[PDB]
Every structure is written in C-alpha cells, then in structure tokens.
Write a protein that binds this ligand. Structure first.
Ligand SMILES: *[C@@H]1O[C@H](CO)[C@@H](O[C@@H]2O[C@H](CO)[C@@H](O[C@@H]3O[C@H](CO)[C@@H](O)[C@H](O[C@H]4O[C@H](CO)[C@@H](O)[C@H](O)[C@@H]4O[C@H]4O[C@H](CO)[C@@H](O)[C@H](O)[C@@H]4O)[C@@H]3O)[C@H](O)[C@H]2NC(C)=O)[C@H](O)[C@H]1NC(C)=O
Ligand SMILES: *[C@@H]1O[C@H](CO)[C@@H](O[C@@H]2O[C@H](CO)[C@@H](O[C@@H]3O[C@H](CO)[C@@H](O)[C@H](O)[C@@H]3O)[C@H](O)[C@H]2NC(C)=O)[C@H](O)[C@H]1NC(C)=O
Ligand SMILES: *[C@@H]1O[C@H](CO)[C@@H](O[C@@H]2O[C@H](CO)[C@@H](O)[C@H](O)[C@H]2NC(C)=O)[C@H](O)[C@H]1NC(C)=O
Ligand SMILES: *[C@@H]1O[C@H](CO)[C@@H](O[C@@H]2O[C@H](CO)[C@@H](O)[C@H](O)[C@H]2NC(C)=O)[C@H](O)[C@H]1NC(C)=O
Ligand SMILES: *[C@@H]1O[C@H](CO)[C@@H](O[C@@H]2O[C@H](CO)[C@@H](O)[C@H](O)[C@H]2NC(C)=O)[C@H](O)[C@H]1NC(C)=O
Ligand SMILES: *[C@@H]1O[C@H](CO)[C@@H](O[C@@H]2O[C@H](CO)[C@@H](O)[C@H](O)[C@H]2NC(C)=O)[C@H](O)[C@H]1NC(C)=O
Ligand SMILES: *[C@@H]1O[C@H](CO)[C@@H](O[C@@H]2O[C@H](CO)[C@@H](O)[C@H](O)[C@H]2NC(C)=O)[C@H](O)[C@H]1NC(C)=O
Ligand SMILES: *[C@@H]1O[C@H](CO)[C@@H](O[C@@H]2O[C@H](CO)[C@@H](O)[C@H](O)[C@H]2NC(C)=O)[C@H](O)[C@H]1NC(C)=O
Ligand SMILES: *[C@@H]1O[C@H](CO)[C@@H](O[C@@H]2O[C@H](CO)[C@@H](O)[C@H](O)[C@H]2NC(C)=O)[C@H](O)[C@H]1NC(C)=O
Ligand SMILES: *[C@@H]1O[C@H](CO)[C@@H](O[C@@H]2O[C@H](CO)[C@@H](O)[C@H](O)[C@H]2NC(C)=O)[C@H](O)[C@H]1NC(C)=O
Ligand SMILES: *[C@@H]1O[C@H](CO)[C@@H](O)[C@H](O)[C@H]1NC(C)=O
Ligand SMILES: *[C@@H]1O[C@H](CO)[C@@H](O)[C@H](O)[C@H]1NC(C)=O
Ligand SMILES: *[C@@H]1O[C@H](CO)[C@@H](O)[C@H](O)[C@H]1NC(C)=O
Ligand SMILES: *[C@@H]1O[C@H](CO)[C@@H](O)[C@H](O)[C@H]1NC(C)=O
Ligand SMILES: *[C@@H]1O[C@H](CO)[C@@H](O)[C@H](O)[C@H]1NC(C)=O
Lengths: 126, 441, 125, 107, 125
C-alpha cells in the first residue's frame, strides 16, 4: 500500500522561509513523478510544483516561480519543498502526491495524481 | 534485431469516403411508402468515442440522390392519371361580378366552352371558373400551357401530405452522424456516431421559408459555403419556431364533366357566399424577436457596427419572387413583403397579414414542357405551420457601402434537402489490413 | 450509450482494437426503389467474395489473425512495435502505409505457392 | 495556462438523486481530464481518469464522458458517502489546472 | 509482348503450366446494357460459388495443388508420368480424359467423409 506522510508545517511570518518534507513508501520512488499541491482556505486546489523521476526536471507555477524549490532524494525516498519570501496567499494545506502511470480503456498511457498525503498546514501571518 | 514479419488482419476498423445508393425505411400518397421497407421500432446508434471526422455539407451526394429520388417518385405518381389534351379549346370568358371585394376584382373568370363526351359524335357546352393567372388572351382566352405542352390532371385520390422517410445504407457501408452542437456544417466534428439509418425527413416543398423543419438545439445558426461571396445563399436555422396560419375562405364546389369513356374532368362549379382573398397570418412580436436573434447572429460575421437591412425580393418568376407552397392540395403563392422590411442599427396581439394567390397549373420543378393541373378542393381550407428557417441572399456587398441588405431567396430545392442532411455522411469500410508481428509460419 | 459495438473500437489503439475483429467481420454481409436496392445488394456480395478470395489466396483462409512468412522490410516503416500496438490507431497506420499496399500482397501470393510445392514434395517421399 | 471552469458552483441534492457536473476548458486537452472528490478534512480521492475511465475500487455509479472542450461527471445514485467537493483537473500540459470546485451537500 | 500472363502458359507443358495457377485463379471473379451486365455478373458469381463448393466438398478448401487419398485407376489412363508432366499440355489431357470426370469426383466426395469420421473417432478417445 502506498504511504505518504508530510511534515515541517507550522506558523511563519511574511518574508520568512520554511521547508516541507514528504516521506514516501510502498512503491518505486525513483520511477514516479512527485507533485506538490496547495489548498488555500476557502479556495480550490492548485498544483504548486512537479519534479520528475530522475530529479533533473522541475517545474513550478507562475505564482511561486523563483521562490519555491522542489527536490527529491531517491536513496531516502524523500521529497522536499523549500519556500522563501512567503506571503499571506501561501497559507493553506500542502499535499505531496505521486503521479502514477495508468492505462485508459483505449490503451493510452498518462499520469494522474493517484495517491496523496494527509497534508500539512502552513500559516503565513504576522 | 527487429525480426518482424507481415501479418494480415481481417475486420480492421478503417473507413474511407465513398458514394453508393441508399434505400428506404418508413413506418395512397405521392411519396410511395408501398415499396419502402418497414423501419425498425428501436433503431440502434453507436457513439464512437474519441473519433474526429471531417464534414462538409456543400459536397454531399445524399442531397443529389434525394433530389433524383423525389423527382422520380413525382414522375411515377402522375403516370396513371387522365391527360387533359381536349381542354385546349377556344374559351369564352367574362368577368365575375357576384359578391367580390375591391382586391379580388378580375381575379376570377367565368368561362364557357364546348367539349367532347363519351361518344365521339356528340359535343356538350359546359362552363367553369378559372383564375386570371391560368388564362391568357388570344373575349377569347386560352390556357397558358396550351402553346407549351399538354399535362395530366392530378388524380383526386392521392394526397400531397409529406411523410417522413429514412435513408439507409447497404451492407458493407456506414453512415456517420455529427452529434456536436454549434457545428456549422463544415470542418472537424469531434463527437461522432454510427447510425444504421437517417432520422425521419419530411420532403416539404417551399420557397423563401423552411416549413415543418428541424430546430437548432442551442441558438440560431447561420451556414454558407462562402460568406464573403454574395453569389452563395445563406441558410438560417432558428432556435424556436414561429406559427403561421394560412387559409383560403372561399367555399369551393366541384363538378365532374365526362370528356370521354372513363375520363372525367373536375371543374369549379360556383362559389357559395362571399368571395375573399386567401391569406396568411404571422405573429408580430415573435417575428420581431426572431429577427433580433438573426441580426444579432449576423453581426458576428459582418462586423459589430454595420447596419443590417431586410428588404423585398429582387424579381424573377413568381415561384422565386413569392413564398410558394401547397396546403391541402391547393398551391399558394404569398407576398412576403411585410416580414423582410426593416433596418437595424448597432447600439401586443396584432399579426402581420400576407395576401396569397392560388394557382392550379403547376410546374413544381424547374422543368419546361411538363405542367400539372390541381383539381379544386371542396370547401374552405385552413392550415397552420412552423417557420424554422430562412434562405437569404446578400445584394451587392462592395466595400464602397457599409450597409448590408439581405433579401429572400429560394428557387433551387436542393437547399431544402441540404438543411436536413447537413450532419450526415456515408463511408465504406476497409476491413483488410497488414501489420508487423513476431510470429513465423 | 452503445459505445462498444461494431466500430466503437475505431478510436482505440491497435492492440485494443485487435480484440474485437469479429463484430466488424459479421456485418460485412448484412417498384423503382426495388431496382436500386437490388443493384446495391449485387455489389456487396461481389466485394465480400473479392475480400474472401484475396484472403484465401495468401493461405490465411478461415482466420482472422493469421501471420505469414514474408519478413517486414524496414524501408516501408521504421517505427517499432513499442509505439505502434499501444501508441497508434488503425486509421493512422492505414493512412501512413496506404502507399505501400500492393507489394506485400504480391509477396504473400508468391510465397504461398512455394510452401504448397514444398509440402507436396515432402509428402511425395 | 489552460483555464478550467466548473458548473454549477454549488448544488443541494437528496439521496438517490442524479448529479451532473460540467467542466470546460479554453483549449482542447484531448480527453486528459480527471475527476477527484474531497471530503472535509481529507485529501482528494481520484474517481475518474481519462474522462471516461473508472478508477479501481470506485463504485460503478460514478461515470464520466464528454469530448472537445466539454466534459461531464455523472453520479447516477447519490449515496450518503458521496457528498463533498468535486474537482476536474487537466493533466495534458503543465501546469495541471484544477477547477473551482462543485460542492454537493445534503438538501 | 505480354506472352506470359493469365493464359500465356496454355501452350506450355503441364509441369511448366502448374507453376502459374494463381494468375488464372485471380481473374475468375473479376439502361438496357446494365441488365445484360448484371445478368453476366450474376452468372459469374454463381459459377465461382459452384467451383468453390466443389473444391470444398473434397477437403481441398483453400488450396491450389491438393493431393487426395483416392488412388488412380489404370483403366482410365495408361500413360506414365514420364510422358505426361513434360510431354503433354493441359488442353490435350483434358480432351483425352473429359469422359472419366464424374467418377473421380464421386470417389473423392465419398472418401472425404470417411476421413472426417475417423478423425472424430480418434479425437473421441
Ligand atoms: C406542416 O404540418 C402540419 C401538421 O402536421 C400540416 O397541417 C396539416 O395539414 C393536413 C393536410 O392539409 C391536415 O389534414 C387534413 O385535415 C382536414 C381537416 O380536418 C381533412 O379534411 C383532410 O382530409 C381530407 O384530405 C385527405 C388527404 O389529405 C383525404 O384522405 C380525406 O379523405 C379528406 O378528403 C376528403 O375531403 C375533401 C374535402 O371535402 C374532399 O375533396 C375529398 O374528396 C375527400 O372527400 C386532411 O386530413 C391537418 O389537419 C393539418 N394539421 C393542422 C394542425 O392543421 C401542414 O400542412 C404542414 N405544412 C406543409 C407545408 O405541408
Ligand atoms: C484520444 O485519441 C488521441 C489520438 O487519437 C490520443 O492522443 C494521443 O495521446 C498519446 C499519449 O500517450 C500521444 O502520444 C505522444 O506521442 C508523441 C509522439 O511524438 C510523444 O512525443 C509523446 O511523448 C506522447 O507519447 C499521441 O501523440 C496522441 N495523439 C495525437 C494525434 O497527438 C488521446 O490520448 C486519446 N484519449 C485518451 C483518453 O487516451
Ligand atoms: C357563370 O356563367 C354561367 C352561364 O352564364 C352561369 O350559369 C347561369 O346562371 C344563371 C343564373 O344563375 C341561370 O339562369 C343560367 O341558366 C345558368 N346557365 C347555365 C348554362 O346553367 C353561372 O351562374 C355563372 N357563375 C358565376 C359565379 O357568375
Ligand atoms: C360551341 O360550338 C358552337 C357551334 O360551332 C358555336 O356556335 C357557333 O359559333 C360560330 C362562331 O361564333 C358561328 O359562326 C356559328 O354560327 C355558331 N353556331 C351555332 C349553332 O351557334 C359556339 O360558339 C361554341 N361555343 C363557344 C363557347 O365558343
Ligand atoms: C470566397 O469568395 C471570394 C470572392 O470571390 C474569393 O476571393 C476571390 O478569389 C478570386 C479567385 O481568383 C479572386 O480573383 C478574387 O480577387 C478574390 N476576391 C476577394 C475579395 O478575395 C474567395 O477565394 C472565396 N473563398 C474561397 C475559400 O475560395
Ligand atoms: C388573420 O388575421 C385577421 C385580422 O388581421 C383575421 O380577420 C378576422 O377573422 C375573424 C375570424 O373569426 C373574424 O371574426 C374577424 O371579423 C376578422 N377581422 C378582420 C379585421 O378581418 C383572420 O381571421 C385571421 N386568419 C387566421 C387564419 O388566423
Ligand atoms: C394560429 O392558430 C392557432 C390555433 O390553431 C392560434 O392559437 C390560439 O392563440 C390564441 C392567442 O391569440 C389563444 O387565445 C388560443 O387559445 C389559441 N388556440 C389554440 C387552439 O391553442 C394562434 O394564435 C394562431 N396564430 C396567429 C398568429 O394568430
Ligand atoms: C417590394 O416593395 C417594392 C416597393 O416597396 C415593390 O415595388 C413595386 O412593384 C410593383 C410591381 O412591379 C410596381 O407597380 C410598384 O410601382 C413598385 N413600387 C416601387 C416603389 O417601386 C416590389 O414589387 C415589392 N416586392 C414584391 C415581390 O412585390
Ligand atoms: C406585395 O405587397 C406590397 C405591399 O402592399 C406591394 O407593394 C405595393 O404595390 C402597390 C401596387 O399594387 C403599390 O400601389 C403600393 O404603393 C406598394 N406599396 C409599397 C409599400 O411599396 C407589392 O406590390 C406586393 N407584391 C406584388 C407582386 O404585387
Ligand atoms: C411546431 O413546433 C412545436 C414546438 O417544437 C411542436 O410541438 C412539439 O411537438 C413535439 C412532437 O414531436 C412534442 O414532443 C413537443 O413536446 C411539442 N412542444 C410543444 C411546446 O408543444 C409542434 O408539433 C410543431 N408543429 C408542427 C406542425 O410540426
Ligand atoms: C375585368 O376586370 C378587369 C379589372 O377590373 C379589367 O381589366 C378587364 O378589362 C375586365 N374585363 C371585362 C369587363 O371583360
Ligand atoms: C407561349 O405563349 C407565351 C405568351 O403568349 C410566350 O411567352 C411563350 O414564349 C410561348 N411559348 C413558346 C414555346 O413560344
Ligand atoms: C465554420 O465554418 C468555417 C468555414 O470555413 C470553418 O472554418 C469553421 O471551423 C466553422 N466553425 C466551427 C466551429 O467549426
Ligand atoms: C359550404 O357550402 C356547403 C353547401 O351549402 C355547406 O354545407 C358548408 O357548411 C359551407 N361551408 C362553410 C364553411 O360554411
Ligand atoms: C415597410 O416598412 C416601412 C417602415 O420602415 C413602412 O412604412 C411600410 O409601410 C412597410 N411596407 C409594408 C409593405 O409593410
């Protein structure tokens, strides 16, 4: 069974920095893409960032580009998100998810966020 | 390394464009259902998931096939009927002045003439009433068609009521239908299905207005092969229908005259009571709302700040100039001048009344040398119909003027069939295929 | 909906579409209007017989998935099975390889007779 | 970025009712749309992927369909456990944009 | 010239003519004038189906050169293979043995059923 556990959240002031860790088990970590998603209170979901299997390919949304950094450790099967210059809009619940390969009924292969973590709360307030 | 070998597969799902001959499927009439196969009570349609097809309503062979079949059926229906060859005689006509209004003065002529009978020796003097459009002066008049050809009298038993017809492809072929709404009849349709037969289509014959047609499911639609060019007609499909009530209030009477052995000619004996013009009524507020929707849609293609004008028809034959149709066996030609008369600038219970004229000598299709005589119908006539589309033509269109004027169109009946088969096409399957595989025989 | 049935596998991959050849195979066979219907019916039988003869001549008579002896030439197509049988549709493959159809037919025709001759020779002993 | 629009924003339905949610994209995404469900205080759970494929273990009442730039999620037989916030996500090109969320609650 | 093709091997020996059966096999299938054309097509289809049925009944379905179990009677013909397969043409042989055609057909038909029955009996065990 796939298991993902998040940690490292809490309270931070505006302009501070914070590291969120996600421990994964129950699957081949090196061969699965990893996603960081955030849910702001009272709003919908948003994909903060993505990192590939090899760890060389990383992408982020425009709202967090240049501030959020995503990294992975395949030996430890761990994922890390370093956030800097945090703002009030960054407050919310951060989830780490796996992009699992699935086959449609037509025989085509794509990747979806099959498994998610419990989430971790980050509050950016003075 | 690959060590691949050729493999034959039978039944591969591949199709190609093709043309074939479709056949009947239906649930005394001119549109003979006797030779048409019964329709299945539960037709089957298969939606093709993740299949995109190319469609072009202006290159459909189904329209040509339907036109040819309709013409053939019309020709066949008139074969066992009386031929009015003796009717070409010198008629002596006078004006009728018995209880007529101002607008119906001279519309009817009381004509007496000699005629043959069952015996080739004897002759009989008879009289009848004719329309001014059917008699041409030679006090002595003659039928308009006498110097062109002698045509048959439509048999009184057959009915001109349209009946739905379903078109079915043969084995080894398939019919693809586009279920994508807002599809304008040309381009890629992403939502496709395979249907064994086409839905019921009524072969309604009319000009300047589509009657008893199908309504768009989303909003008013505009279709044209080349909207920039003025020579191509514009097909407008409404979202909601407009009720039109047509009526001939004259109380007609029919009398049979024996012109030979087992041959009778039906004539209008006399009119009981007052004589008044037949006419049609159309709701005013509904028509205004429909025209508002139409101009709103037209502004998309012809600029957001242009002036949109509706005016009268240019000219030509009576069939193309006026709204021509048939109701209850009587052929009406209505003057649609009060409808398409307005201007639009970017920014209760009264009904529009259209007078109409009835005709008996008919040339339904654009053919010369084959007319048709409609026998008179006894009693007053009334009918109600749905307006669900228009055929419009752009005048001029040069860059000198920013004002766009549209006028009623028609004439060619292929447009009537094209308005229903715009979301259908026919293909033929190619089951055999070759691929690479790792076997070895 | 009736998504699956007859041509429902048109949008699926070749590997998935190869599992439902029978539903396409079945339907290939089945006063003025009667003449047109008869004329239409006359052509379907001819097409079916042509297809059956073409299949039988190659030695794959009475088979829906029949492999043969002629090897695949790399010139006609360079794509490998990895991106064909589960990353392509039958329509796309037919469109790509519609140009090179007849040569494989001729090769199969000339290959079948050699196998027949060899079988006769072995049975002669 | 591809913008995702959901409809209706919120809805109240009773047990046994049929629920239909529509999702629209500004640009074609083939059929790479996935429908997820979220309960209060829980992470999202996938129901549909590929716009018509049901995830293993999900009840058969959930279904998805559509094409072009319009996709539909259908819950035929609403149950007490299906109430929550439904989202439609496109995963054809990065970023993978989610919808605004449709909240189905007890009437 | 097109000396070889379809019936080009008519004047050759039986051994040489047996190498090109496929060219003959292919061509067997393919307002007032249309009626005659339709009649001819119907007759051709009927003839092709008759030939296919006759081939199938003998157990040589889907084969161009198929030997069988019925032995050759010396009474029908006395010439040996030495002066037949390379010293005679197919037309000459058909002219010579046009009389004795039906008996061999009946023998083949009655022989096929016994083989089918024996195969069923063997598979029963
Ligand atoms: C669009 O659709 C609408 C509705 O579908 C169409 O309107 C309908 O039109 C039909 C045909 O006109 C009409 O049906 C007639 O109703 C009359 C009044 O009830 C009937 O009297 C008439 O029956 C006569 O005609 C039949 C053949 O059509 C005969 O079989 C029948 O025996 C009757 O004929 C006898 O009587 C006449 C007159 O006395 C006599 O001359 C004969 O010898 C014979 O003795 C039809 O049943 C519907 O009532 C209309 N519907 C409505 C709601 O009004 C409309 O026409 C369509 N538009 C177009 C353009 O086609
Ligand atoms: C519905 O059908 C369409 C096509 O009929 C499917 O789109 C196809 O999706 C696959 C994804 O596996 C694409 O594969 C891609 O191939 C390119 C080749 O260069 C490669 O670079 C990519 O990495 C990827 O592997 C394929 O190209 C694409 N088809 C087209 C024509 O673009 C679609 O997936 C189907 N729907 C579903 C839900 O599967
Ligand atoms: C059309 O003309 C005929 C003939 O003139 C009219 O029939 C005559 O009607 C008068 C009075 O109604 C009779 O006295 C005559 O005997 C009738 N003539 C015949 C030959 O019967 C007929 O009424 C006229 N119809 C109309 C509408 O004016
Ligand atoms: C029906 O036929 C009669 C007889 O031919 C026509 O009456 C003749 O008309 C011509 C020309 O007007 C005269 O020269 C004859 O003297 C008339 N003969 C008789 C006996 O009247 C009569 O006009 C014809 N009917 C119609 C309507 O023209
Ligand atoms: C739609 O009609 C316009 C008008 O005729 C076409 O454009 C013309 O094309 C001809 C072709 O030789 C030129 O001579 C004209 O100068 C063009 N006129 C304009 C105003 O462009 C146009 O090509 C048609 N549409 C299509 C798709 O062919
Ligand atoms: C079309 O509209 C006209 C009025 O514009 C109608 O005329 C009236 O018809 C009724 C019939 O019951 C008469 O009682 C009235 O006296 C008429 N009034 C006028 C001013 O003509 C006509 O009936 C309508 N026809 C249809 C078929 O709806
Ligand atoms: C055409 O005729 C229909 C009836 O055949 C008319 O419908 C009537 O509309 C009036 C409104 O003015 C209602 O009071 C009646 O109850 C309706 N009758 C029926 C049977 O529904 C319709 O209004 C007519 N159209 C026009 C433009 O006059
Ligand atoms: C549309 O309206 C115009 C004028 O409003 C009509 O033109 C009239 O045509 C008649 C018949 O030829 C002439 O007697 C009039 O003098 C014309 N009027 C004008 C002002 O020129 C035109 O006929 C109408 N359309 C139809 C089809 O009748
Ligand atoms: C159709 O109706 C219009 C409107 O009544 C007719 O136009 C009128 O025609 C008469 C000639 O009979 C003129 O005296 C009027 O001045 C015209 N009115 C307008 C507003 O132009 C038109 O003629 C009718 N169509 C036909 C073929 O007669
Ligand atoms: C004119 O249009 C109306 C509305 O589309 C038709 O009434 C519909 O008829 C269908 C029958 O197939 C029913 O299923 C709908 O419920 C009806 N709708 C309404 C609002 O009544 C009407 O039948 C049409 N008239 C003609 C002659 O075709
Ligand atoms: C009949 O009436 C019309 C219109 O009033 C007139 O033109 C014609 O000359 C009249 N014919 C007669 C009185 O013979
Ligand atoms: C018949 O007469 C009308 C009017 O007199 C004329 O317009 C028409 O051309 C004539 N027909 C022929 C074939 O000349
Ligand atoms: C409308 O028709 C034009 C004709 O060229 C076509 O290009 C366009 O794609 C059509 N609209 C849609 C939505 O397909
Ligand atoms: C027409 O005339 C006949 C005969 O007088 C009569 O029975 C019928 O009622 C009349 N029709 C109308 C609509 O008045
Ligand atoms: C056409 O519309 C004008 C108003 O723009 C009006 O004065 C005229 O009477 C109308 N003509 C007809 C025949 O209704």
């Amino acid at each position: 069974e796939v298991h993902l556990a998040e940690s490292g959240g809490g309270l931070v002031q505006p302009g501070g920095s914070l590291r969120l860790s996600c421990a994964a088990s129950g699957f081949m970590f090196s061969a699965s893409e990893m996603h960081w998603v955030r849910q702001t209170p009272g709003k919908g979901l948003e994909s903060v960032s993505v990192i590939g299997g090899s760890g060389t390919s990383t992408q982020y949304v425009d709202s967090v580009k240049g501030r959020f950094t995503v990294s992975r450790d395949n030996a430890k099967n761990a994922l890390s998100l370093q956030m800097d210059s945090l703002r009030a809009e960054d407050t919310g619940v951060y989830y780490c998810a796996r992009g699992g390969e699935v086959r449609s009924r037509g025989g085509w292969k794509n990747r979806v966020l099959d498994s998610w973590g419990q989430g971790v709360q980050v509050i950016v307030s003075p | 390394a690959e060590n691949l070998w050729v493999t034959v597969y039978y039944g591969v799902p591949v199709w190609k464009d093709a043309e074939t001959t479709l056949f009947c499927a239906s649930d005394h009439n001119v549109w003979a259902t006797h030779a048409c196969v019964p329709t299945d009570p539960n037709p089957q349609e298969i939606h093709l998931e993740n299949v995109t097809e190319e469609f072009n309503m202006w290159k459909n062979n189904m329209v040509e096939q339907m036109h040819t079949d309709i013409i053939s059926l019309w020709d066949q229906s008139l074969k066992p009927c009386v031929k009015l060859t003796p009717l070409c005689v010198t008629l002596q006509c006078t004006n009728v002045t018995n209880n007529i209004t101002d607008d119906m003065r001279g519309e009817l002529k009381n004509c007496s003439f000699n005629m043959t009978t069952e015996l080739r020796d004897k002759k009989q003097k008879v009289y009848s009433l004719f329309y001014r459009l059917d008699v041409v002066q030679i006090k002595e008049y003659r039928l308009i068609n006498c110097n062109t050809s002698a045509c048959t009298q439509a048999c009184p038993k057959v009915s001109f009521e349209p009946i739905p017809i379903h078109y079915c492809a043969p084995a080894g072929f398939a019919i693809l239908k586009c279920k994508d709404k807002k599809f304008n009849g040309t381009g890629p349709c992403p939502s496709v299905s395979t249907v064994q037969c086409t839905h019921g289509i009524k072969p309604v014959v009319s000009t300047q207005l589509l009657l008893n047609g199908s309504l768009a499911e989303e909003e008013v639609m505009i279709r044209s092969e080349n909207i920039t060019n003025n020579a191509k007609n514009i097909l407008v499909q409404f979202n909601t229908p407009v009720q039109i009530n047509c009526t001939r209030p004259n109380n007609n009477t029919r009398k049979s005259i024996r012109i030979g052995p087992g041959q009778a000619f039906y004539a209008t004996g006399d009119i009981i009571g007052d004589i008044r013009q037949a006419h049609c009524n159309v709701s005013k507020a509904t028509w205004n709302e429909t025209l508002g929707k139409v101009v709103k849609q037209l502004r998309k293609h012809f600029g957001n700040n242009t002036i949109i004008r509706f005016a009268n028809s240019s000219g030509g034959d009576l069939e193309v100039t006026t709204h021509s149709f048939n109701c209850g066996g009587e052929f009406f030609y209505c003057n649609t001048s009060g409808l398409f008369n307005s201007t639009w600038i970017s920014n209760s219970n009264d009904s529009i009344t259209l007078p109409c004229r009835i005709k008996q000598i008919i040339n339904m299709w654009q053919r010369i040398g084959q007319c048709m005589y409609a026998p008179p119908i006894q009693g007053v006539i009334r009918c109600v119909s749905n307006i669900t589309g228009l055929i419009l033509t752009r005048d001029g269109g040069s860059t000198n003027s920013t004002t766009e004027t549209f006028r009623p169109g028609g004439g060619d009946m292929r447009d009537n069939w094209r308005s229903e088969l715009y979301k259908y096409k026919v293909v033929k399957i190619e089951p055999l295929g070759v691929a690479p595989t790792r076997c070895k025989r | 909906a009736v998504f699956l049935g007859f041509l429902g596998a048109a949008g699926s991959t070749m590997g998935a579409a190869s599992m439902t050849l029978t539903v396409q195979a079945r339907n290939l066979l089945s006063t003025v209007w009667g003449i047109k219907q008869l004329q239409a019916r006359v052509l379907a039988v001819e097409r079916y017989l042509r297809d059956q003869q073409l299949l039988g001549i190659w030695g794959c008579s009475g088979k829906l998935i029949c492999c043969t002896n002629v090897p695949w030439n790399s010139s006609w197509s360079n794509r490998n099975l990895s991106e064909i049988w589960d990353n392509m549709t039958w329509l796309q493959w037919d469109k790509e390889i519609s140009n090179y159809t007849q040569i494989i037919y001729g090769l199969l025709e000339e290959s079948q007779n050699q196998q027949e001759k060899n079988e006769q020779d072995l049975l002669a002993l | 970025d591809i913008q995702m629009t959901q409809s209706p924003s919120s809805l109240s339905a009773s047990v046994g009712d049929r629920v239909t949610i529509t999702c629209q994209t500004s640009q074609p995404v083939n059929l790479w749309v996935a429908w997820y469900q979220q309960k209060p205080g829980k992470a999202p759970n996938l129901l549909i992927f590929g716009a018509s494929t049901l995830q293993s273990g999900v009840p058969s009442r959930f279904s998805g369909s559509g094409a072009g730039t319009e996709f539909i999620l259908t819950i035929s037989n609403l149950q007490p456990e299906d109430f929550g916030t439904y989202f439609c996500q496109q995963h054809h090109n990065f970023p993978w944009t989610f919808g605004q969320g449709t909240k189905v609650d007890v009437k």
